[PDB]
Design an enzyme around this catalytic site. Sequence first.
Site, PDB file in Angstrom:
ATOM      1  N   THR A   1       6.094  -7.562   9.236  1.00 46.29           N
ATOM      2  CA  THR A   1       4.679  -8.510   9.984  1.00 46.29           C
ATOM      3  C   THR A   1       4.353  -7.826  11.010  1.00 46.29           C
ATOM      4  OG1 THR A   1       5.832 -10.774   9.774  1.00 46.29           O
ATOM      5  CG2 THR A   1       4.188 -11.071  10.854  1.00 46.29           C
TER       6      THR A   1
ATOM      7  N   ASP B   1      -1.464 -10.134  10.496  1.00 46.48           N
ATOM      8  CA  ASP B   1      -1.977  -9.342  10.094  1.00 46.48           C
ATOM      9  C   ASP B   1      -1.140 -10.174   8.458  1.00 46.48           C
ATOM     10  OD1 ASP B   1       1.162  -9.316   9.356  1.00 46.48           O
ATOM     11  OD2 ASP B   1       1.246  -7.603   7.876  1.00 46.48           O
TER      12      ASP B   1
ATOM     13  N   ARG C   1      -0.204  -9.710   4.927  1.00 49.57           N
ATOM     14  CA  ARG C   1       0.706  -8.895   3.959  1.00 49.57           C
ATOM     15  C   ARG C   1       2.325  -9.496   4.204  1.00 49.57           C
ATOM     16  NH1 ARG C   1       1.579  -2.300   2.724  1.00 49.57           N
ATOM     17  NH2 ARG C   1      -0.245  -3.284   1.943  1.00 49.57           N
TER      18      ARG C   1
ATOM     19  N   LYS D   1      -0.040 -16.077   8.186  1.00 48.78           N
ATOM     20  CA  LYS D   1       1.378 -16.511   9.319  1.00 48.78           C
ATOM     21  C   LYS D   1       0.833 -16.691  10.525  1.00 48.78           C
ATOM     22  CE  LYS D   1       2.932 -12.309   7.208  1.00 48.78           C
ATOM     23  NZ  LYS D   1       2.932 -10.401   7.273  1.00 48.78           N
TER      24      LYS D   1
ATOM     25  N   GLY E   1       9.897 -11.969  10.391  1.00 46.87           N
ATOM     26  CA  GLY E   1      11.466 -11.802   9.498  1.00 46.87           C
ATOM     27  C   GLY E   1      10.981 -13.132   8.749  1.00 46.87           C
TER      28      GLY E   1
ATOM     29  N   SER F   1       7.829  -5.575  12.768  1.00 49.88           N
ATOM     30  CA  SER F   1       8.287  -3.829  11.540  1.00 49.88           C
ATOM     31  C   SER F   1       7.007  -3.332  12.630  1.00 49.88           C
ATOM     32  CB  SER F   1       7.778  -4.263  10.648  1.00 49.88           C
ATOM     33  OG  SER F   1       7.157  -4.289   9.973  1.00 49.88           O
TER      34      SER F   1
ATOM     35  N   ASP G   1       1.816   0.887  10.349  1.00 52.94           N
ATOM     36  CA  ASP G   1       3.202   0.388   9.537  1.00 52.94           C
ATOM     37  C   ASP G   1       3.657  -0.313   7.541  1.00 52.94           C
ATOM     38  OD1 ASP G   1       5.502  -1.445   8.609  1.00 52.94           O
ATOM     39  OD2 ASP G   1       5.870  -1.977  10.442  1.00 52.94           O
TER      40      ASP G   1
ATOM     41  N   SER H   1       3.475  -4.130   6.891  1.00 45.28           N
ATOM     42  CA  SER H   1       2.181  -4.968   7.864  1.00 45.28           C
ATOM     43  C   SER H   1       1.216  -3.928   6.520  1.00 45.28           C
ATOM     44  CB  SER H   1       1.611  -4.709   8.488  1.00 45.28           C
ATOM     45  OG  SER H   1       3.104  -4.932   9.675  1.00 45.28           O
TER      46      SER H   1
END
Lengths: 259, 238, 96, 245, 103, 205, 234, 251, 197, 213
Positions: A39, A55, A57, A71, A85, A167, A204, A207
């Site tokens: 995330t 995001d 994904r 999310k 997480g 992340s 990232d 993400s």
Amino acid sequence: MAAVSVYAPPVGGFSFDNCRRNAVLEADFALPKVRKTGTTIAGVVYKDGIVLGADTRATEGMVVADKNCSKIHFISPNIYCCGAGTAADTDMTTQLISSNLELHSLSTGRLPRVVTANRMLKQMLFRYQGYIGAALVLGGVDVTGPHLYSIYPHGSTDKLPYVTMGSGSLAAMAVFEDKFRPDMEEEEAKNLVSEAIAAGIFNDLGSGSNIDLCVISKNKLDFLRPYTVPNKKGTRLGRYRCEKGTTAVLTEKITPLEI
Amino acid sequence: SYDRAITVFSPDGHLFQVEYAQEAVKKGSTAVGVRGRDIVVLGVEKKSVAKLQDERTVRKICALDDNVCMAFAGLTADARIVINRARVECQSHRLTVEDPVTVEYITRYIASLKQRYTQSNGRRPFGISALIVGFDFDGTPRLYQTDPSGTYHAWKANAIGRGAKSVREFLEKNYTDEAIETDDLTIKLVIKALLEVVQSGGKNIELAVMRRDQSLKILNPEEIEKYVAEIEKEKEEN
Amino acid sequence: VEKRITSPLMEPSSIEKIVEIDAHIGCAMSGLIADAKTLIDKARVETQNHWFTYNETMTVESVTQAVSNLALQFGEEDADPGAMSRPFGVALLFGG
Amino acid sequence: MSRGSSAGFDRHITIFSPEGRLYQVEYAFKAINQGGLTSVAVRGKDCAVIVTQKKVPDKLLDSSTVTHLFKITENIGCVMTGMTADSRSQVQRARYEAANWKYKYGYEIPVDMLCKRIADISQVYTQNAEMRPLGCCMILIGIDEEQGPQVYKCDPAGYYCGFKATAAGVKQTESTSFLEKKVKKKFDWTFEQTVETAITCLSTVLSIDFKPSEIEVGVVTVENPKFRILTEAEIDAHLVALAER
Amino acid sequence: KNELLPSHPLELSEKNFQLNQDKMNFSTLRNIQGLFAPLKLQMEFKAVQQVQRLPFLSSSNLSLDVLRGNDETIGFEDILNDPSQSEVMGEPHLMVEYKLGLL
Amino acid sequence: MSIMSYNGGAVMAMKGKNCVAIAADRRFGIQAQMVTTDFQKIFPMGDRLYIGLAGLATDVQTVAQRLKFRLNLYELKEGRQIKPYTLMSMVANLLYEKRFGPYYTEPVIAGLDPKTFKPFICSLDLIGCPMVTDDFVVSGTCAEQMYGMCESLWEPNMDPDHLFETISQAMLNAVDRDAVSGMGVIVHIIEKDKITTRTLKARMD
Amino acid sequence: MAERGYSFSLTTFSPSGKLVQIEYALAAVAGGAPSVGIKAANGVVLATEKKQKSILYDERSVHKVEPITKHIGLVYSGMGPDYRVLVHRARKLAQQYYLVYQEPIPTAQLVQRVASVMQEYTQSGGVRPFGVSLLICGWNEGRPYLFQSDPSGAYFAWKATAMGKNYVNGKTFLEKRYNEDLELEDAIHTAILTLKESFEGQMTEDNIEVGICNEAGFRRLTPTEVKDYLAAIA
Amino acid sequence: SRRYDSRTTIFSPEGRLYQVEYAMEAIGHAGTCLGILANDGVLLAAERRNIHKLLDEVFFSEKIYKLNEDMACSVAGITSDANVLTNELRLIAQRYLLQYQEPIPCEQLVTALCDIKQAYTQFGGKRPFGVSLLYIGWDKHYGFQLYQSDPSGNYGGWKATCIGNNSAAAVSMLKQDYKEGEMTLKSALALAIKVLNKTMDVSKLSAEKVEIATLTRENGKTVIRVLKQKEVEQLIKKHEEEEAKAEREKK
Amino acid sequence: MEYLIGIQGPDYVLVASDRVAASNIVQMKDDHDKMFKMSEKILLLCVGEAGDTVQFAEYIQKNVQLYKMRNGYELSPTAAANFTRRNLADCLRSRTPYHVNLLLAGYDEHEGPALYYMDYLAALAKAPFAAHGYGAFLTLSILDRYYTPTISRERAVELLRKCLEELQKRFILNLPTFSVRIIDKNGIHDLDNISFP
Amino acid sequence: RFSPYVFNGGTILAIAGEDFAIVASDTRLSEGFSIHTRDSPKCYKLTDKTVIGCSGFHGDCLTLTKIIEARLKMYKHSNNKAMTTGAIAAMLSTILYSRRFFPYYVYNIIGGLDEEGKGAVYSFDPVGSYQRDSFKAGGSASAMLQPLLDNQVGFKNMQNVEHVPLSLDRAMRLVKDVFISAAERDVYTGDALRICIVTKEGIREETVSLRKD
């Protein structure tokens, strides 16, 4: 009913009497993975309220599982949360706290406070000693004004004008540090959050996909799920449209269903 | 009062609630069981031949185990509970000891359960008297009778329920070693006892036969009527 | 002790009123039969526990004392498990 | 109950009357009356005031310890009428509940929620057989962030309603009538006005003119949300102002 | 038996979560209030729990929830697995005797 | 080795136009040894509702049986056919009830709305993570192959028969590249008018 | 047939087979404030009277009509504190259902759970039945719902009913007035008229409390709206 | 007696539990519930009792309760106790299905519920369940069965029995007009209609005072359906025509 | 280590098992019967970890006998298999796992013959034929090669003999004697033990 | 980490006779490479006809001795008689096996007269197993002491020898010699030797000085 020798009444609550199986299986050879969401969630405190970002994904291992995942979770009409997480852990935590806050508001008859939700979340997370992986960004606008919190899985919180989690949090937080102003406008805050989420998405691996936004203010609640669509699938060149009869079958069982 | 609380002792020394459970047992239908050489047979007098009722669901004679049987007289629900507990204990014993359950062991267990329920005033005693009959490991026939109080006694021939006294006198008068020797003799003895209990007899006879190394089997009304006809012919001859 | 045989059909051996607590201890009961059975079971268990623990025979006085300690828990056991709500209705003669 | 449920309809809390009334709750109200004192609480647009008569029976008795004004938290105070021990127990329970609410929810408990919890406990008392209703009455005051001054009275039956002018004790009916008359005539209801209204209501229903030592007054204002106990000199000043006009 | 050893370090804590919470509340009251509050609450809980359905039937424990302050609080305990949907129920008399302490 | 790879398994569900399709493999085996070629991984949870479980076989069966228990009780209490979303929520609650030691299965639910007859497909994680996507959902030891085939083949608004063709091709090509999955494929095509159950021919290697 | 010992106890059956304590709880309900519920085609209205002893009563402090969730509300006749406890339990049950199934709890299921709680309290010996009956309203699957949970735990689905004092007369009035295809904003007038029949004096905005439920959800009418309805109907 | 009828556990001097008898009297106070067994299938015909015009019927079964796929039951007694008992019945049936993966036999479920009721009657401080249940079901061992439960905890398999109001008259009528072996579903429905018409003396049945549910086996699947109001009206009309024809023939 | 085998025919289920009970390197018992009589029509072939085998087999056997006593009719083979799987899974998940490999065989008057395979993880699976132990690896190939759905009883015994001969030829452990039983509509019939001296 | 057990040394030895039961032990309490104290006899008298020696972990030895004393008092209160040596041995075995999964690190040797007036020596292991012997040595130097006891008291490996009954003076001399040898070769022994002679008259305590480290 049950068969012989059942004495104790059923015990409500979590059922942990299943880890011996895990130990035996691991001893036999070398555990499956669960969606960690990879995330990038961020939020800011502007002049009139809170802007949250996320995001869409969800990644299981190193393979994209969900290309469109919500999310930003609903906690109350004036309070919203973002989850990072373990996906299921964040979902269940947010749902439970939302139900508790709904009960609290019904009993009180007044809008819930962000501090109450933060306290409940952190107390439960500490009770579970961080075994529940819930990287949460809590934001809302109660009677005391806008508030933004960053709740870690172990049960530590911090009230800050802007927070990032996940992340890809470092890229978003770098964008914030570069382009943050006290008492931003609604459009400026939305743009800043969108840029932070986009930076996390493009920098990232965990993400990606689309950008979610949630503008919270004392006047309106603006939930923007398809706020932006930076990345999209390319056009399919060749057609692999399978025609009838391509696949060979062995058995046929047609079962009509009554209407 | 003294007669209302199970735990309270009467000035004479009686636990009148246990005696009231015994009275409830007496209110039940007559159950008769005799013992013979390698043949144990039970008999229960049906209170009424209720039409439009399935006789299988209201049977009074059941099999605790493949080698033990039991008949009751009193409250049907209490009898069902005690029967289920006895079956569970029989299987538990066959598990832990690996040996077939002795009639003594299950009779003791049932008596202990009844006495434990007589212990506290919160729990009422089981209002049933049971005739546990079967064969031991060596095949020796065994007949036993329990009471709501929790006292079990071995009998050569016993009757429980309503009209138990008259049937007991009948059995005492007409119990002979020759009758025990022949299985048909024991069956005829039980038929005669139950016919003395109830004049109508016939369809009201619920008789079950258990022999050496043979599972409990309930004679159909055809066989019961055949035995009744045999008894009637014997009486006519005299 | 005297066997009260209500009817000849009942087995006289079934009416047991003198039992064996241990090889060197016997007991004669008078009163409620099932209370006697419970007390006899307690006495036998106590004697076997004493033999197991100390590798010696339990004194008759000790067995009687243990059975008495069991036979005074009416409203005073202070134990969750169902205890002797009413006093035992049997008197025992531990002759050994 | 461990001892055993009583026979008569009015001899036990649980069993109903033929109409369906619970006589033990009414007897708890009679106990509240048996307390012997009267408490008057008045709600204004700037402050909330609670006034109750202080009766030190004996000279040896230390007047400092004799008080029916207790503070639940720093901003909420209460006046208790009825049995002293029961009132103390309810005060302790309210203090614990307020502290737990502050710990768990991150903000101070509202007065309405405090009485709601107290009334729920009281209902639990009136439903089971082992316990009995507390023979006392709780009147809570405090300044809400948005609703301003709040006055709530909190009874054995489990009724937690809020009032503009609360009365409790022996003279509850007469005090209620006087307060209804005053409320029907809507004044400015300033701080000193509310204090004067409470004191004069109590004096009228008791048919006596209080000196500084015969009453205890607790106030809580919007400007000063902390629960404050009026010093005897301030009560004497208010009484002198009443006497002058 | 090996069942005494917890399978998970968190299992022992969350299995007795309600008992531990009640113990902590009693400890806090007793630290601050005194001996009267824990004893009072213990008697109150005993009284409410003494009256309920038999073990083989699921009880509501409404008064217990009100006294414990959980009447308006929901946790994973209440939702994840329903005591009503036990999926395992013993003999009624056996369960009653077990609760009575006979077994 | 991974616990999922202990018994293998591969379940796929796809969505068409007013129709839904679900397919699964038929192999049951301990590690490398095969035992049976008829193991059932798709269980009916209603007329127009099926759930396919991939993973440890014993956990699959336990989850299916417990879910059927809860479903029967729910339908008896409410007196109405369960919604696909409600079934997903029930499965998520069941899986999260065993969070700290999980049921080693990743169910996928495919079915039509009992009232609106709207196709619905979803996938659940180890600990019950809902995931509703309009294109397709896959689960098993060959997740990558199934994902690739579905992405390359799936099209919007598929004709039931051609939806069956697409899902069958995807499943066959995915399992043919997986060692612990295969030995036949079962496909259920669920439509409001009827449901078609088809068994495909596949490499028995 | 005095049957005093049978009437004292709850678990004790009367010789005729009647649970007297349940009847006493029902009498307590009948002695409560009147409350009227009408299930119209467009929606369902729950109107009750909140008899304020004196003008020094804060109308916002307590409410006879309380929301359970976003679409379910209820009103009561009888004992207030019991009603509050049952409201808390109903809210907790509704939230548990939402958490488990992620769907708003149907009104029928909530009524069944509340009735189960009432039965649990009226079964065991040691407590008294809840001396209160709940008129529960809701809107599920595009359909209004009206239920009445008695102290014994028996719940009935009504189209129109009244409880509390003069409930028989209120039910007769509803029978005379209620119509099959009656819509909202008119069933409100019918409930107001029924309260007028059951009210002693003049009904103001603060003397009564009206709550409606429709497709949007349950909503307690503000005092201003109650005043406009009262003016319209008189 | 005014004694031995307080704790639900006091045996009378003659050995009577008066509280159970009072519960049975309460059952007698309930509405008429009738069940008839036939070779084609078994049915339950129960009086709806509540007929208030303002009352609404949102459920498909006013008092009939489906326990599982292969079973159904009807109630005559206390409504809330009946609700909890039906919930327990469903729970037990589903537990058996979970454990054995096969439908529970009718006798097993009846025995489990009767054990629950007997346990409630055995331990003091608990009010006995004042509900009598009639069970209809089909299993692979005995096929169609009809069972009757009592507050005491005693069940029994019947071919035609009635519980509730005017139970004795209904039982006598069934004994008079039941043909063991030759009873079919249609004749069973006619007999049930006659019994209900005679027992309920308020007036002729209007298909809203009664509720009939039939259990049958079609294509190897147990079908439990509640007869529609029109079908009940047709059955009542047929019964009235038969009665009128008999009266005319009598002359 | 311990070998189980089961072959299901049109109206029978042939099962066999070795009679070797070995501790360390010595065969303590050479006539150890591993077949447990569930009922008059059901058998339970159980092998596994020392005490788990006997305990689990006897527990399930007593449960089945209790069902027979209470209800008066025996459990169906499918019902018995499901009950065994449920209990095994419950115990495995708990703190006392049972490491037992099961092979349930039975005949039903309605469903007919039935053979059920179960591993120590309690994964039920009905198969026409199955085997357990390290010999299953060597014998399943022969079963696949020579099995026919309409296989006669004598042909089934011949195939079993082929499997046992392969075990003697290739399997490291010696298994001279095998106890062979068959389940027909008439009950459980004990056949002559196949021995390889 | 945390180690619940440590070895504090100590050597015990018991010799049975016709009318005597010698129980001897050293007074060296040494943990690690240091000496805790030079005066700590390992033999504690239980009754007038029983003396028990404990060696190993000192804390476990103290706890076990206190438990044994409490159990002796309980037995005297219950059975109204002093526990016999065999009864003490059986009770000690049961106590030791009670804490089987957290075993006492104590080497126990019970020496005293039996009901017939004959010396009885019971040797125990940490788990609890015990048997009656004529002589036994326990502790750190048990292996060093046992061979000479076998050679002399048991007359083992002695061809054409006279099996003279073991006298008291010979037993004391043998005990002194064996403990002197142990002090010479075992670092855990020395300082002093506490000898408890259990005879029908009573228990006599004798102290013999051993060479210090």
